[PDB]
Chain A
Amino acid sequence: EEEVKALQKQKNLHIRRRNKLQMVESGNRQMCLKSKDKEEETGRAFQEVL
């Protein structure tokens, strides 16, 4: 019963950490899509200098 409680606590921790990782990853993926638009903008600015 202590082991079931420990595993329930660990399950709840992994659910919370996964939700946080998915928030970080979703924010990061939105930053990365915009950072690709930035790589195209800086790639255009680099072509302008060329």
Chain B
Amino acid sequence: HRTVRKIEGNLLWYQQLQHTEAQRTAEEEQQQRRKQLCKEILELRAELHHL
């Protein structure tokens, strides 16, 4: 049961670590979408001010 825990928890650990690296590429797409939304908010606020 001690060997099983060492095997499973190291696998779980490195899976979580790879999931954090794959999250960085999703963070770049999310940052691009956030820049797009902030640009759209600024355009909408400017149109609202003119209205």
A9 to chain B, nearest CB (A): 11
Interface size class of chain A, counting residues whose CB lies under 8 Å from the partner chain: 10 to 19
> For chains A and B in complex, what number of residue pairs have CB atoms within 8 angstroms?
21
Whether A4 lies near B51 (C-beta < 8 A) is: no
Q: B51 touching A11 by the CB < 8 A rule? A: yes
B contact face: mostly helix, strand, loop, or mixed: helix
Q: Please indicate which of the listed interface residues B44, B45, B47 has the most CB atoms of chain A within 10 Å of its own CB.
A: B44
CB distance from B36 to the nearest CB of A (A): 10
Q: How far is the CB of A46 from chain B (nearest CB, A)?
A: 43
The SS class assigned to the A binding surface is: helix
- Listed in ascending order, the chain A residues whose CB lies under 8 Å from chain B are 1, 3-4, 7-8, 10-11, 14-15, 18
Interface residues of B, Cβ cutoff 8 Å to A: 37, 40-41, 44-45, 47-48, 51
21 contacts between A and B (CB under 8 A): A1-B37, A3-B37, A3-B41, A4-B37, A4-B40, A4-B41, A4-B44, A7-B41, A7-B44, A7-B45, A7-B48, A8-B44, A10-B48, A11-B44, A11-B47, A11-B48, A11-B51, A14-B48, A14-B51, A15-B51, A18-B51
